[model samples]
Target: KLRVALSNHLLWSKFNQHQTEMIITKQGRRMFPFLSFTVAGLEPTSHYRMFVDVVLVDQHHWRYQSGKWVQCGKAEGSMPGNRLYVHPDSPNTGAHWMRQEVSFGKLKLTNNKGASNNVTQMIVLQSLHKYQPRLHIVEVNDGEPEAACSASNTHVFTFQETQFIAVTAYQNAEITQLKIDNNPFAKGFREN
Candidate 1:
């Protein structure tokens, strides 16, 4: 029953002027306007595993060709469905999770689709295709004999505002501002 929201809705809307970007690369890059969230309905003493997934929003793949999104082919999946960056404090008590805003800012986007030793390393995807971030929550069936009993309560949360396109760099100005304002890596963009 844990409800969630993008840490900030107004900014998400501002960047939605023309949608957003992920910009996959050979070595890949960390998502700037990364998914960050808040929580409620969590039992303070309970333990949970939270995943942030990025899924293909449209049926077809796309590219930013000549100046606009052009359908190319089929789309691919990203995280909370695929393996994802795990919170360092994961498996900790809900009190720890509910302590403040949760940020998936640590994850990176790589053009390479190979499964590797790291979860955040490969986000193999279409260059300019659309995406949606989904959140999954499950209680840790800790020490309970009925481990499989936890399956009935898996929670999934989806957001339309969290959707964006894959890119090596942002094409939307509002998204640029969104990153410059929210991302530490982009803090100096205006300074230079």
Candidate 2:
């Protein structure tokens, strides 16, 4: 398993460099600065699954309107759910991921309305909010569906206060932090 974090050091820097921006309105908006990741260790023909999730500290709070950090509000509904993006070319048999190159496109942000937001916004974060991103890797086995594949383990990536930023609207955002986790189930699995 390989572990990696943002090479740029801070998320804000990436946001600033990318000119990330988020649009906010009465209608919900989608985040411009998408999150991305890369992996480098895997068998050529093996199938794999990838996912991204947002994590917020229990005691922290975020106020989008105020543009400032605040204390946690009364317990709200469950934390925001995770949005999973699967690689376009998946379920390849006897294929080696490390043999060539694999790129998972940007992970987008959207509001409840399902409309794209043009302004720059934090990860819907409040000021002084503490949050981290988690990545899960698992092997896709035959005779099983994609959803049935269990995640072997979870890799956690922490983002600091300085690393949050929204990219300019309609612009491309890439994940500099490349994370990889070995598939424990693939150790002796049949190839092809």
Candidate 3:
């Protein structure tokens, strides 16, 4: 069996301590403490494809009220189109994948109604809803193409700590501060 582990587990831990919040935008927003992993036990010669898709964590929509997250109402229906964000380095040798952390930092989240055509590398998500990121690893065979054999050999991984609420603007000040302090892109907003 293949083993997969979070590469920057501690960084995610700190964010999770405050119940991580992910900002969703019409223009697409990148996740902080992004999904990155290390894998072991794949046969060196075998080819593998890895991708991520986020799914609703529960049936309820959420709100940050009085310093707590509460279920405010029922969730909106799931997005209509496919949500998979395939790693750009997919279908590579197992040896290549195991060599370094498989980072999905490039994946973005959007609340755009036309996300299918409006954004690249973006997954549509509803704001104020909790969702979980799921990692899927599929082994590709030399004889069969990825489209035909991929689903049959898929392995799915879910980390509870990576679950987060999607927001248009961060509702938590601590989460905002953490993002400013840790995300290099937000360095301009950080205090020196």
Best candidate (score: lDDT): 3
Candidate 1 lDDT over 1-192, as tens digits, reads: 566666867766766666677667777677656678788788888778877667777766666666676787554534323435556567677887888978877677766666465455445665666777777776765444455543446577888887888776766565666677777766778776
Write model 2 residue lDDT over 1-192, tens digit each, in one string. 554343333444645443334433333343323344345555656666554455544543444334433445765534543334444555453244443444433344434333345343223433233344455556655554564555343344444432332212222322222110122333453342
Give the candidates in order of lDDT, highest first. Answer: 3, 1, 2
Q: For model 3, state the Cα shift of residue 154 in Å.
A: 4.0
lDDT of 3 by residue, 40-63 (tens): 878888778888888777878788
Q: What is the TM-score of each candidate against the true structure?
A: 0.78, 0.46, 0.89
Q: Model 1 clash pairs?
A: 23-167, 23-168, 52-80, 53-79, 53-80, 54-79
Highest TM-score model number: 3
TM-score of 2: 0.46
Worst 10 residues of 2 by lDDT: 173-182
Off by over 4 Å in 3: 79-82, 116-119, 142-152
Candidate number with the higher lDDT (1 or 2): 1
